[PDB]
Amino acid sequence: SALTQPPSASGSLGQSVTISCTGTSSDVGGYNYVSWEQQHAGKAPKVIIYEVNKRPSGVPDRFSGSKSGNTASLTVSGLQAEDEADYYCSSYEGSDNAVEGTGTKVTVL
Amino acid sequence: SALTQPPSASGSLGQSVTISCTGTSSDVGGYNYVSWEQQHAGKAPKVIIYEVNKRPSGVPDRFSGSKSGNTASLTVSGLQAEDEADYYCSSYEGSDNAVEGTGTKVTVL
Amino acid sequence: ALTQPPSASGSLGQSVTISCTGTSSDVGGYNYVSWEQQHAGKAPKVIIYEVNKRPSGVPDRFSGSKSGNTASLTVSGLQAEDEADYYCSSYEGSDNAVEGTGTKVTVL
Amino acid sequence: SALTQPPSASGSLGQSVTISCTGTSSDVGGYNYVSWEQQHAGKAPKVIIYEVNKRPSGVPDRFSGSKSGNTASLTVSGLQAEDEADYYCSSYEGSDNAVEGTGTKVTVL
Amino acid sequence: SALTQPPSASGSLGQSVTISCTGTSSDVGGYNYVSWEQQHAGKAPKVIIYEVNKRPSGVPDRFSGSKSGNTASLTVSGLQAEDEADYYCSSYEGSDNAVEGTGTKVTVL
Amino acid sequence: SALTQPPSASGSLGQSVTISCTGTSSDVGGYNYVSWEQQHAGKAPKVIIYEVNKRPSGVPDRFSGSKSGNTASLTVSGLQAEDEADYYCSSYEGSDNAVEGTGTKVTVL
Amino acid sequence: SALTQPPSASGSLGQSVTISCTGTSSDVGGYNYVSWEQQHAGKAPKVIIYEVNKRPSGVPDRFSGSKSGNTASLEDEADYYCSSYEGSDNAVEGTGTKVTVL
Amino acid sequence: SALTQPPSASGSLGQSVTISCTGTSSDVGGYNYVSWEQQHAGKAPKVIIYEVNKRPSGVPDRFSGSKSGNTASLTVSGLQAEDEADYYCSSYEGSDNAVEGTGTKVTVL
């Protein structure tokens, strides 16, 4: 199930940090529906990237995302104090989304 | 993982047979995407009902389908020889369709 | 195919009504029935779409409706230019699926 | 109407078998929604591949699928005894979504 | 405004004929929803191509379609007797599909 | 082809104003896609209602919309200074969205 | 903007707790796509309810969810966040340009 | 959150003016659904371009639109007196379609 991220990363004020998020062909490699959430300690998460590289309203362009193959990336440039937080990526996950019946043999007499 | 059907059913030529297909709120009770396939021995299945009660082109009106709650039904009236076969129901199955990352603590130095 | 009577008639000034029977997959399933009017060896012209809506420049004496699996066109104040073939059409639903003939795999 | 598959195929224990599934631009050549089902005699089919090359949970990686143009392929490697079965491919089919009336000649008297 | 077609075309039994259908960026050049209907004299039309190059069930592959820019084409090869008919192309036509209100000046006291 | 609105309306601070928007079965009476935009003099419009009665983020619940038959309504309660503006309704408009070719008579041999 | 939840709630071992989640017709009142996530401190969230009242595999039945109007309701010491599908006008407007001629 | 346009632009009678409209990958760079409205002082807006470069009926070809990357453009050539007006661009905006709760800390006694 889970998408692999490094547990720690760092950068300096004004600089850039990049964090990665590895999954499989069922999610990150399969679809363009990767998101990144930013969460301060004991606060609710905020979406900062959806659909791989698209920013919600009021999220600045210094946050950006991309992917290649099964690895997605978030990059934060012009790093600021408010950017210290946990960052979780998420993705659409595939499933055949189908359940099959056991079958009924109909005989005609 | 499966929709419950009786394994046997019968009817006579010219008569009706009805066969049931029980699932849950995740599939039959949750959506209007139940299908029925008809399959002759060592032959490929053919869809006879989709979206609960809709017939593909070239499937006659004596085949019909419905559902209530978690149980869907196929009815075959004016039963004919070609109707002796196995009959499998299927349905869309729900799933949260989402996978979560392990998280990265970003520190700003 | 949607069932229509092949012939119908009316007198000048009068009305004619023609029917169009389908199934729950089309006429009984959706509100997307159209009627086209076509003169011999001429291109069809849409006269009704979405069951009862007229395109621009089509007069109100053409009108349409449906009930259950049967849709209807009515032409009132019948005129000479109204002699033509009239075809109904409808959105058709689809399972959107095609099945293969199968292969028996043997393990030797 | 139907997707073309060879009716027989074979392989030896431990080896590979590959089976093909030819359609048109309306299905296999048009979309990435080709599935393969595996079915044992008088048993219900099980989905083994969906969306061309994606495996449901609990289906091993030795089953794999692909396509090129109008032909899709299932490959089974490390062939085992339980793999003797019928295998059916299926695909999303596009549709003009339109049905035409037979016409009425209106005469004005 | 109508789509331009030559009023006549011809071919010999066994040979090919190709017929063109010119529109604008609002229809043929704007979308992939061009159709071709075949119609015998005083008979109802039958769809033979939809969505530019896709064939309905039971329509053979010797009918084919394509487009480039604002011109779409139907090609019939292996010409047969039953292929003598009128052939009409059609397309989705764009429109902003929006109607505007005249506006209300709201004053607050 | 315009939706009818009264050109003027008024209310006092703290009070309510309601403004109407009449169309036809082709738009307001035909679909649930009516919008209302608010526009200050020589400023760009802002959407305040879409899909008849749904508010975008950051638009308060004192703006509300509804419709009955061919008439849609916007209501502003707890009227405030910033609410003095022009208000335009808009709607999805239907059209058969289809264009027909002139036809080609194909002769064989 | 955000769905309203009480910031604290309390229950005793063996007992029940219920927590609420108020939104609008654009989300909780508009659709059946409300979720609840459970999150331990500095750990990743886990979905415990989706589509209002449906439990993922391996989540026990003692967790349950429901909604009425705009209000949805739902180691166990943790933070619990609800979320929902949000509808959208799906449109953005330009600031405008006054065009002058000559 | 808004699309950037210059507030003023000018041209001479008979000449051309071009005005730009910069957004992001969520709208102008993401989709082909950019529109331009023309609005005279205290009059209702009129759509002059939709779907990037398509003109509604009765709008002449001297109005034209295009885009490259995140910038869309309207060009008016053969400039006339009636063309003095405000001009607003708009675009489909993508959306994560998700709203997050503020969170509840549950404590157990």
The 3-class secondary structure across chain B, one letter per residue, is CEEECCCEEEECCCCCEEEEEECCCCCCCCCCCEEEEEECCCCCCEEEEECCCECCCCCCCCEEEEEECCEEEEEECCCCHHHCEEEEEEEECCCCCEEEECCEEEEEC
User: Does the distance separating the beta carbons of H25 and A54 come in below 8 Å?
Assistant: yes
Instruction: Report the C-alpha gap between B68 and B71 in whole angstroms.
Output: 6
Of A23, A79, A100, the CB nearest to B88: A100
Helices (H), strands (E): how many in chain F?
Answer: 0, 9
Cβ proximity of H73 and G48 under 8 Å: no
Cβ proximity of B71 and B20 under 8 Å: yes
Widest Cα–Cα separation across chain F: 82
Set out the domains of chain F in order of their start, with CATH numbers. Answer: 1-109 (2.60.40.10)
Chain centre to alpha carbon of residue H103: 37
| φ, ψ of residue F47 in degrees (nearest 5) | -75, 130
- Cβ-Cβ contacts under 8 Å for G43 (sequence gap 6 or more): B103
Instruction: Report the C-alpha gap between C92 and C1 in whole angstroms.
Output: 10
Cβ proximity of F51 and F107 under 8 Å: no
- Burial of E58 (C-beta count, 10 Å sphere; 0-12/13-18/19+): exposed
- Count of alpha carbons within 13 angstroms of residue E102, beta-carbon side: 13
Nearest CA in chain H to E103: H44
Cβ proximity of B5 and A104 under 8 Å: yes
Which DSSP letter does residue E78 get? S
CB atoms within 10 A of CB C88: 31
- Burial of H87 (C-beta count, 10 Å sphere; 0-12/13-18/19+): buried
Nearest CA in chain F to C49: F96
Instruction: Report the C-alpha gap between C2 and C28 in whole angstroms.
Output: 11
SS3 E81: helix
Nearest CA in chain C to F96: C49
Strand (E) or helix (H) holding A76: strand A71-76
Instruction: Report the C-alpha gap between D11 and D84 in whole angstroms.
Output: 10
- The region that residue A82 occupies, defined by phi over 0 for left and psi between -120 and 50 for alpha, beta otherwise, is alpha
Tell me how far CA of residue C29 lies from CA of C51, C66, D59, D99, in angstroms. Answer: 12, 11, 38, 13
Q: How far is F51 from chain E (nearest CA, A)?
A: 13
Nearest CA in chain D to B4: D44
Instruction: Report the C-alpha gap between B10 and B87 in whole angstroms.
Output: 12
Q: What angle do CA F96, F101, F102 make, to 5 degrees?
A: 130
Helices (H), strands (E): how many in chain H?
Answer: 0, 9
End-to-end CA distance of chain D: 45
CB atoms within 10 A of CB H14: 10
Cβ proximity of A38 and A46 under 8 Å: yes
Which DSSP letter does residue H50 get? B
Widest Cα–Cα separation across chain G: 80
- Count of alpha carbons within 13 angstroms of residue B81, beta-carbon side: 0
Q: How far is B77 from chain G (nearest CA, A)?
A: 37
Instruction: Report the C-alpha gap between E21 and E1 in whole angstroms.
Output: 13
Q: Which residue has the tokens 């058969």?
A: F96
Strand (E) or helix (H) holding G23: none
As a dihedral over the C-alpha atoms of residue H51, residue H56, residue H60, residue H63, rounded to 10 degrees, the angle is: -30
Q: How far is G57 from chain H (nearest CA, A)?
A: 23
User: Does the distance separating the beta carbons of C41 and E86 come in below 8 Å?
Assistant: yes
Cβ proximity of G102 and H15 under 8 Å: no
Q: Which residue has the tokens 């292969």?
A: C103
3-state secondary structure chain D: CEEECCCEEEECCCCCEEEEEECCCCCCCCCCCEEEEEECCCCCCEEEEECCCECCCCCCCCEEEEEECCEEEEEECCCCHHHCEEEEEEEECCCCCEEEECCEEEEEC
Cβ proximity of B42 and D7 under 8 Å: no
Cβ proximity of G45 and G64 under 8 Å: no
Residues of E in contact with F107 (CB under 8 A): 8-10, 84
| Nearest CA-CA partner of D19 in D48, D58, D41 | D48
Instruction: Report the C-alpha gap between B80 and B16 in whole angstroms.
Output: 10
Q: Which residue has the tokens 């292929």?
A: E83
- Burial of B69 (C-beta count, 10 Å sphere; 0-12/13-18/19+): exposed
Tell me how far CA of residue G46 lies from CA of A32, A37, B96, F18, G37, in angstroms. Answer: 22, 14, 12, 46, 5
SS3 H2: coil
Cβ density class F54-74: b for 16+ within 10 Å, e for less? bbbbebeeebbbebeebebbb
Strand H46-49 to B46-49 pairing: unpaired
User: Does the distance separating the beta carbons of A41 and G81 come in below 8 Å?
Assistant: no
User: Does the distance separating the beta carbons of D101 and E50 come in below 8 Å?
Assistant: no
- The region that residue H62 occupies, defined by phi over 0 for left and psi between -120 and 50 for alpha, beta otherwise, is alpha
Which DSSP letter does residue F56 get? P
| Nearest CA-CA partner of F39 in H85, E105, H84 | E105
Which DSSP letter does residue H17 get? E
Cβ proximity of D87 and D39 under 8 Å: yes
| φ, ψ of residue B82 in degrees (nearest 5) | -55, -15
Strand D104-108 to F104-108 pairing: unpaired
Q: Which two tokens stand for residue E27?
A: 């229809």
Instruction: Report the C-alpha gap between B50 and B63 in whole angstroms.
Output: 11
| Nearest CA-CA partner of G24 in F41, D29, B73, F62 | F62
Of C1, C94, C107, the CB nearest to D102: C1
Q: Which two tokens stand for residue H52?
A: 């990037």
Instruction: Report the C-alpha gap between A88 and A93 in whole angstroms.
Output: 16
Tell me how far CA of residue B99 lies from CA of B74, F17, G81, H1, H96, in angstroms. Answer: 36, 47, 16, 30, 16
CB atoms within 10 A of CB A85: 21
Instruction: Report the C-alpha gap between C28 and H34 in whole angstroms.
Output: 37
Resolution number, Å? 2.7
User: Does the distance separating the beta carbons of C26 and D105 come in below 8 Å?
Assistant: no
Instruction: Report the C-alpha gap between E40 and E26 in whole angstroms.
Output: 29
Cβ proximity of A91 and A23 under 8 Å: yes
- Contact: chain E with chain D (3+ CB pairs below 8 Å): yes
Strand A104-108 to C7-10 pairing: unpaired
Residues of B in contact with A8 (CB under 8 A): 104-105, 107
User: Does the distance separating the beta carbons of A9 and B99 come in below 8 Å?
Assistant: no
Which DSSP letter does residue C86 get? E
User: Does the distance separating the beta carbons of C43 and F101 come in below 8 Å?
Assistant: yes
SS3 C82: helix
Instruction: Report the C-alpha gap between D11 and B27 in whole angstroms.
Output: 37
User: Does the distance separating the beta carbons of C40 and E2 come in below 8 Å?
Assistant: no
Q: Which two tokens stand for residue B75?
A: 């009815």
User: Does the distance separating the beta carbons of D81 and C105 come in below 8 Å?
Assistant: no
- Burial of B81 (C-beta count, 10 Å sphere; 0-12/13-18/19+): exposed
Cβ proximity of F12 and F79 under 8 Å: yes
Instruction: Report the C-alpha gap between E97 and F4 in whole angstroms.
Output: 17
- Burial of D31 (C-beta count, 10 Å sphere; 0-12/13-18/19+): middle
SS3 F92: strand
Q: Name residue E44's beta-bridge partners.
A: none
Q: Name residue A74's beta-bridge partners.
A: A19, A65
Tell me how far CA of residue C43 lies from CA of C63, E51, E82, E87, in angstroms. Answer: 21, 20, 20, 10
Q: Which residue has the tokens 């499937």?
A: B59
Nearest CA in chain G to B101: G44
- Count of alpha carbons within 13 angstroms of residue H81, beta-carbon side: 0
Cβ proximity of G101 and H80 under 8 Å: yes
Instruction: Report the C-alpha gap between A5 and A11 in whole angstroms.
Output: 16
Of B35, B46, B55, the CB nearest to C25: B55
- The region that residue F57 occupies, defined by phi over 0 for left and psi between -120 and 50 for alpha, beta otherwise, is beta
